[PDB]
From a paper:
The motor protein myosin-15 is necessary for the development and maintenance of mechanosensory stereocilia, and mutations in myosin-15 cause hereditary deafness. [name] (encoded by the [name] gene in mouse and [name] in humans) is a plus-end directed molecular motor essential for stereocilia development and maintenance. Here, we present cryo–electron microscopy structures of myosin-15 bound to F-[name], providing a framework for interpreting the impacts of deafness mutations on motor activity and [name] nucleation. We propose myosin-15 enhances polymerization by bridging [name] protomers, regulating nucleation efficiency by modulating [name]’s structural plasticity in a myosin nucleotide state–dependent manner.
In a companion study, we identified the myosin-15 missense mutation p.D1647G, hereafter referred to as the jordan mutant, in a forward genetic screen for lesions leading to progressive hearing loss in mice. Although its [name]-activated ATPase activity (wild type, kcat = 5.8 s−1; jordan, kcat = 0.87 s−1) and F-[name] binding affinity (wild type, kATPase = 29.1 μM; jordan, kATPase = 114.3 μM) are somewhat compromised, purified jordan myosin-15 is nevertheless an active motor, and WHRN, EPS8, GPSM2 and GNAI3 localize to the tips of developing stereocilia in the jordan mouse, leading us to hypothesize that myosin-15 could control stereocilium height through additional mechanisms. Consistently, we found that a minimal motor domain truncation of myosin-15 (S1-like fragment) markedly stimulates [name] polymerization in vitro, with the nucleotide-free “rigor” state specifically acting as a nucleation factor, while the jordan mutant instead suppresses [name] assembly [figure 6 in (25)]. To gain insight into structural mechanisms underlying the jordan mutant’s suppression of [name] assembly and disruption of stereocilia growth, we next compared the rigor structures of wild-type and jordan mutant actomyosin-15. Collectively, these data suggest that the jordan mutation also does not grossly disrupt the [name]–myosin-15 interface or myosin-15’s overall conformational remodeling of F-[name]. We thus turned to an alternative hypothesis, wherein the jordan mutant disrupts [name] structural plasticity rather than global [name] conformation. The D-loop is clearly resolved in the jordan mutant reconstruction, and the backbone and side chain of each residue can be fully fit into the density, adopting an In conformation indistinguishable from the wild-type reconstruction. Density for the Out conformation, on the other hand, is completely absent, demonstrating that the jordan mutant locks the D-loop in the In conformation and eliminates its flexibility. Consistent with the helically averaged map, symmetry expansion and focused classification (K = 4) failed to recover any classes with Out D-loop density.
Numbering used by the authors:
A (entry chain D): 1205 to 1734, 1749 to 1813, 1818 to 1889
B (entry chain B), C (entry chain A), D (entry chain C): 3 to 375
The structure:
């Protein structure tokens, strides 16, 4: 009880004070600590006796304010705001992999499911049983965690007067580059290995799927031995769960065929063959091409024409243009990228369609967004993650500044003209059209003679003396951007090989002629729904813009997750990990904005016997600070005092020892 | 947001228009303004004093076809404005009041042409922003390189623009006024040897179509001259749009030979094969290493089958033996200018290089000579 | 610990840099600052106003090559700083904030040159300690002796510095301003006799390469003058970087003869063969015994094949008969200055002779005239 | 008796011939060899395969005009012999079998040119005695002095030859290949900006005549650039030989500005104003006192009105303030070379300096390199 659970209750806010308070709190299992309307949490790396059903019932309503912080409080307050405002809102959860964010989302989902008497309806659990497919499609091995979600999860569930209506799930961000290229000592998505592990022998020999060590799309990291960690059992469990959804066996066979074709697409080899005047393209063997065509039941000649020739056409003419080796490889990678992305979109659409959606009622939205990432060698993927986290941190800063402003207003009305930086230059350095880094890369993608190194020169000249841009001292192929979490370097390698989609119209038209209904219908829908989505960066920016234009009109509330230890160490807290997590989550932006309301009565009365200054102040107001100013030349900056608080106490840091030393010198 | 700046290549012959970003023009049609010449008798069939574009290609039997652009200089403006209005409204169905436009224009044309073009496209159409580029640079963009000698030969010009590492050489640019129109005229004047006469402007299109379909470039001119008089294998037939079939002998390859021996039509200047060589040896010394290996060509008149071989042979004969000669002949040369224009207009860096309406208003039409080039 | 003090020989032509202790420089490249001169047209290919070092040797067809050092006096500082910054960062990848640097500098150059060099390398680069030495003494170190007359002739100077038993003779130092640059200019002006013209700065490198590869020093000048007009055995051919092959006759040995008859280019002073003799007979009497036997030479311009024989013959003709003349011609003369600098910087005794930052701060740039020499 | 030795100045453009002693050439006409190109139809109007001299200037509408001399090097000999035969027989009506001839020739031309010239004029014409001189020295004779820097710029060369008290300075001679022909080509390429095209060789004479009649040198280039865009007073008109009248604006003084800013046509070397300064500061120190005061110039390209003022201003800006700059501009510069040749050939002392036929017979064409210079 000697500790403090609300950061607002703390008078002086320091990083050392925050870490000390958290270290004092965690022994008493105060995982949840209030910072106002924002709540954070830590991972105990163990199981806990679960917040019983009583916390859902008698701690709801106004009682959450007087209750100790808990996960159910934010959901209860969100439902209270639903009832009070009749408008939709959102709940956003952040953090790194292994911090229990998925488990936290499951817990909050079961809490909002059990808050009413409609728990006897199966649809409240059918949404949860269709979950494992998503993180099965979304988890890939990472240097920080073997089970890391590399996609953005959005779930929108309607609740009309406590009755849980249909739930709509959607995805916004997806690392399409990880489909074809993987970092060193890293794996692809687990489903590609699960198909290898759990497929029947007859289907394996019919599809020729025993070449995992040969597949170019899986051996990039050189680490396939982790695929034996109960992945066959996971495959069987996933098939059982998706059969619970009622997904037909023929459609499962179609999905397996498409995945096998995607994997076999990596077996296509291109070589420099002198056709007419320059070396253009060649294939060692068409057997892989024929297998790919037969898996989707498409004409092999058309696929070869599309992958080896770029076709331009108009009303009058149709002309085929031969493609170089690099361009052919890029197109072969991009077709697989779009195939996998559209498969994921179709499957999430099927999941949303299986559960019946209801009309437009009150709803609560939950975003499962991974937090800041910083590896040893940061690639384009890490740049995208940092940009998304920068936008999320901008929203967090806006909400925190609004809360601080309303606190000041409740304190004094003269704080309306107080404003701080809103992280705009950091976003504008990348998102602005004329000289944004992503925009510059997108422009350089179509340039005739564009290499990785020329991009460095373009960025260095265009940005130059920007305060947030950190040019490397030595001529190395990299640069550094100063985010809110500090300077982060980015090694420029294979950006031009990663930031290119350019899906042609002939490729789209070839697949809708296939005799499989699923892919033909899916590609027809994709063509019907589709702007400037030429490259991967443009698509990522468009998805982020769609997310923000979905979010802005809700004024949501966030919750933060932390990892007290780098690996599975229960109950171990160390300062360096605390600082790293605080920097990554952007929690220190709160104290940055705050720099508070110390009443001088405590300071005056504390030294009643030593300094012997009169403790008998009949009216504690402006006279004390005015006397301090007259005795120490205090700047007008220490003004706009409220009733007895709102003291920034900058000069007090040097005044305390000045007043202390003369008293001690007497002895 | 993304304004999707238009690219409207206004060549001497056909006109290519479309949106930036795409890999193919959205509108291809001859730039011909036709006016009726006969006396209308039926009531209600008149009141059409100008057929513009492709609709004037089918009704040409009663029209007089006039090209508003000859040799690349716009000699007629009242109908060029009509052609531009057609190309925008009746073809692309997009109002240029909220879309930037990017034009294509010859290297050594008179300045008054560009000034009047700028005046027309800012005052009448009220385009927010406009830019003028050189067709050779866009063609070089379309070839996926940054170093080479560009030989573009449309219907009015034939210009060599050598570029090295993105730096132009204005002292080595040579422009020739021998192009497809002169080839069509020479074919028309040489078909009369066999008895076929094409006098009115309506038959010029027939001659042009014959040239497009049947003409080809010989490898050795004298060898095929000897062969034609001793055999009938080179003879091919074409059908006029009235039922009668003509046969063309050695006039298939004697028509495009004017591009290599311009003394046929009275021109004194040598063919393009020697013009390229003389343009290359007007540059520095350590640059020919790349220019002899990056001989990129474009334009409509360069798809005559066999040109990329005779040109290479001639340049190899002219060039020193130790050096290597390479000819770049993409299969989409006639659309290379539009492809390069679309690539340029899609660059986010180029967005600063536009000529917005404020600068033109505060400077006038003379701003083209400083901003565009 | 061991700071591994750098040695960056900044000659009139090439620049040699590396670490002390090693027996070979780690960076050799011409000291040329080039700027583009043509009009850029491609978007994104500009924004490069200075190509420094070897990267400006391949793109010289569109650049203007300017030497920041002529005759050994640094006449341009803004680009010399660029060259030094390149040599450190972009080439050696070592920050000079924690590495001492040792410079090389001509004997009789103006004092302001050394003062400004010291100011630049302490203020901008913030080098902890710097020293300036004389190239002749380092060359003598590189020859493994402590007594001899050093004839170093780079691209800007040709100086004789006699040293006896480690004691210098400042009254006998003679410096001549005839060096490789004047030889290149004379070859360029004499090649026009056969019809070959090299006007722009880009062809100066071709002339220099021709001089490096084909030139040689005749033994008897008049005898080969007679031989050349009566035979074609001396003629050799070189290929320009465009395909055409030139043939050079008696201009192979008429170019380096300027070093022995400087009246060819208008200079009145006699050749180096007599300059060495006059420098030797400006010393004492009991010293010539060793100076005539230890005629060590270095510099780039002294590897013309046959120089060590003609020089010896001329000195023997000038010197008295009873005495013996010996010429020391190590096969690595052009790197002898750097070898000597590395040997000096590796000595633990020399560590006291540095100019640390404190002394410069308390004294200023004038400390060079007392500490370095 | 008095043989009246001929003087036949064979320049890059016009050719001046006459007798020694007189003060004016007896024959001025362009050195152009023309050949018919069209197909003759009338019987008896052919059999004329070469029109040489002024008679090829009126019939140029059916001829191809080829200059046998370019840049000052005789690149064509079969027609140069025809030109010489015309100049002697059909023009001067004197047999060279009994008259000595004195030639004019550029300073830094290839030796083979002089050797072949000597061979031609001794074997074919059988001239008893011949001599070759330098045009700059004869021009200096024509100015009535023996000390000054001669700037002669004809149609193929632009060379500075400083002479002091009758002694030449071969180490300070700088030759530039920018002359009247490049000015004509630049004017031809810049007239296309206004819409005027001159493609064939017959219109090159029209361009040259326009340059001769209307061109002038501006005093301050930027000031007149500003003035031209704000007024029409500088515009003047010329009439082509077909009836149509052209108007030329700021192209009158933008054509000869290439002589001062040769970067216009791609040349890197600076203008003649700085070339003269650099040639003067390649001489000794006690000589510039006279060279800055005796800046004699000649050649055809130096009568553009205003050159003697801009050149003086530029040299004064370059030269130190205390010194005085004087420009000598006689009104007969283009005939100064012939005047000097006639003055030299009339001297009785020079009669010993001839190359008689016996010496050539016993020595061969190589005697030119010893006797003439
Ligand atoms: N297959 C062909 N063979 C010969 N000539 C052709 C062929 N196709 C097109 N052309 C010529 O190309 C010309 C069209 O060129 P165009 O694309 O209009 O150039 P620009 O756009 O520069 O004016 C036509 O006049 C036609 O004569
Ligand atoms: N094989 C060679 N023959 C003749 N001259 C040479 C040869 N090699 C180099 N040189 C000359 O040496 C010069 C380089 O000298 P350099 O090492 O720069 O001297 P420093 O370092 O004192 O300036 C070049 O200008 C070149 O002309
Ligand atoms: N009034 C003039 N203004 C400008 N240029 C002129 C004028 N008169 C003659 N020229 C130029 O002078 C050239 C003739 O020079 P020329 O006497 O032939 O010299 P050279 O005899 O040395 O060849 C012509 O090419 C012409 O362009
Ligand atoms: Mg064109
Ligand atoms: Mg040296
Ligand atoms: Mg002359």
């Amino acid at each position: 009880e000697d500790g403090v659970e609300d950061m607002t209750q703390l008078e002086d806010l320091q990083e050392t004070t925050v870490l000390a308070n958290l270290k004092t709190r965690f022994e008493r299992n105060l995982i949840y600590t209030y910072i106002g309307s924002i709540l954070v949490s830590v991972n105990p790396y163990r199981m806990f006796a679960i917040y019983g059903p009583e916390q859902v019932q008698q701690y709801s309503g106004r009682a959450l304010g007087e209750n100790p912080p808990h996960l159910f409080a934010i959901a209860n307050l969100a439902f209270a705001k639903m009832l009070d405002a009749k408008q939709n809102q959102c709940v956003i959860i952040s953090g790194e992999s292994g911090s229990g964010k998925t488990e936290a989302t499951k817990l909050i989902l079961r809490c909002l499911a059990a808050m009413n008497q409609r728990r006897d309806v199966m649809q409240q659990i059918k949404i949860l049983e269709a979950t494992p497919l998503l993180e099965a499609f979304g988890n890939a091995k990472t240097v920080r965690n073997d089970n890391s979600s590399r996609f953005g999860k959005f779930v929108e569930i309607f609740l009309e007067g406590g009755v849980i209506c249909g739930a709509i799930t959607s995805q916004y961000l997806l690392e399409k580059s990880r489909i074809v290229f993987q970092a060193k000592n890293e794996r692809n998505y687990h489903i590609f290995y699960e198909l290898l592990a759990g497929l029947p022998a007859q289907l394996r020999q019919a599809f020729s799927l025993q070449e995992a060590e040969t597949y170019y799309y899986l051996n990039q990291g050189g680490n396939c031995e982790i695929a034996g960690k109960s992945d066959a059992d996971d495959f069987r469990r996933l098939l059982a769960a998706m059969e619970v959804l009622g997904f037909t066996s023929e459609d499962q066979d179609s999905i397996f065929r498409i995945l096998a074709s995607i994997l076999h697409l990596g077996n296509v080899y291109f070589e420099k063959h002198e056709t007419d005047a320059q070396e253009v393209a060649s294939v060692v063997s068409a057997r892989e091409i024929q297998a790919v065509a037969e898996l989707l039941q498409v004409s092999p000649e058309g696929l070869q024409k599309a992958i080896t020739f770029k076709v331009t056409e108009t009303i009058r003419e149709k002309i085929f243009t031969p493609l170089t080796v690099e361009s052919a490889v890029d197109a072969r990678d991009a077709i697989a990228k779009v195939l996998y992305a559209l498969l994921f979109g179709w499957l999430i659409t099927r999941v949303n369609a299986l559960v019946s959606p209801k009309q437009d009622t009150l709803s609560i939205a939950i975003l499962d967004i991974y937090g800041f990432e910083d590896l040893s060698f940061n690639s384009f993927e890490q740049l995208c993650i940092n940009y998304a986290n920068e936008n999320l941190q901008y929203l967090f800063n806006k909400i925190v500044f609004q809360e601080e402003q309303e606190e000041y207003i409740r304190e004094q009305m003269d704080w309306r003209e107080i404003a701080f930086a809103d992280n705009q230059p950091c976003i504008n350095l990348i998102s602005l059209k004329p000289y944004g880094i992503l925009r510059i890369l997108d422009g350089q993608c179509c340039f005739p003679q564009a290499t990785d190194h020329t991009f460095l020169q373009k960025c260095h000249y265009h940005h130059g003396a920007n305060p947030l841009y950190s040019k490397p001292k030595m001529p190395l192929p990299e640069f550094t951007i100063k985010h809110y979490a500090g300077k982060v370097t980015y090694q420029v390698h294979k950006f031009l090989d990663k930031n290119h989609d350019q899906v042609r119209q002939d490729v789209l038209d070839l697949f809708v002629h296939s005799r499989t209904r699923v892919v033909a219908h899916l590609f027809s829908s994709h063509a019907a729904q589709t702007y400037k989505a030429h490259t991967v960066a443009a698509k990522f920016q468009q998805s982020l813009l769609d997310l923000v234009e979905k979010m802005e009109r809700c004024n949501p509330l966030f919750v933060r997750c932390l990892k007290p230890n780098h690996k599975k160490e229960p109950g171990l807290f160390e300062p360096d990990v605390m600082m790293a997590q605080l920097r990554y989550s952007g929690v220190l932006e709160t104290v940055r904005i705050r720099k508070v309301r110390l009443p001088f009565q405590v300071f005056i009365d504390r030294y009643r016997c030593l300094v012997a200054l009169k403790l008998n102040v009949p009216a504690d107001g402006d006279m004390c600070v005015s006397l301090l100013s007259r005795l120490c030349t205090v700047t007008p900056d220490m003004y706009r005092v409220g009733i007895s608080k709102l003291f920034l106490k900058e000069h007090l840091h040097q005044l305390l020892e000045s007043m202390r030393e003369r008293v001690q010198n007497r002895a | 947001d993304e304004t999707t700046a238009l690219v409207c290549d206004n060549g001497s012959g056909l006109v290519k228009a479309g949106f930036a970003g795409d890999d193919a023009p959205r509108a291809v049609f001859p730039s011909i303004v036709g006016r009726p010449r006969h006396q209308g008798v039926m009531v209600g069939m008149g009141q059409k004093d100008s057929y513009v574009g492709d609709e004037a290609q089918s009704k040409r039997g009663i029209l007089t076809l006039k090209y508003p652009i000859e040799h690349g200089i716009i000699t007629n403006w009242d109908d060029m404005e009509k052609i531009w209005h057609h190309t925008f409204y009746n073809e692309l169905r997009v109002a240029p009041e909220e879309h930037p436009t990017l034009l294509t224009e010859a290297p050594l044309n008179p300045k008054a042409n560009r000034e009047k073009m700028t005046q027309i496209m800012f005052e009448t159409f009220n385009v927010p922003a406009m830019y003028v580029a050189i067709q050779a640079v866009l063609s070089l963009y379309a070839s996926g390189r940054t170093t080479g000698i560009v030989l573009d030969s449309g219907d009015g010009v034939t210009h060599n623009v050598p570029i090295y590492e993105g730096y132009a050489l204005p002292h080595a640019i040579m422009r020739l006024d021998l192009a497809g129109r002169d080839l069509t005229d020479y074919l028309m004047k040489i078909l009369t040897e066999r008895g076929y006469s094409f006098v009115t402007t309506a038959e010029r299109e027939i001659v042009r179509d014959i040239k497009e379909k049947l003409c080809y470039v010989a490898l050795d001119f004298e060898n095929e001259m000897a062969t034609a008089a001793s055999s009938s294998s080179l003879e091919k037939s074409y059908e006029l749009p009235d039922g009668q079939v003509i046969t063309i002998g050695n006039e298939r390859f004697r028509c495009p030979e004017t591009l290599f021996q311009p003394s046929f039509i009275g021109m004194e200047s040598a063919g393009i094969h020697e013009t390229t060589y003389n343009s290359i040896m007007k540059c520095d010394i350590d640059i020919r290493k790349d220019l002899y290996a990056n001989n990129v060509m474009s334009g409509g008149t360069t798809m005559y089958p066999g040109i990329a071989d005779r040109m290479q042979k001639e340049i190899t004969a002219l060039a020193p033996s130790t050096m290597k000669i390479k000819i770049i002949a993409p299969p989409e040369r006639k659309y290379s200018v539009w492809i390069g224009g679309s690539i340029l207009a899609s660059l986010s860096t180029f967005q600063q290089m536009w000529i917005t309406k404020q600068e033109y208003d505060e400077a006038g039409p003379s701003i083209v000579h400083r901003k565009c080039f």
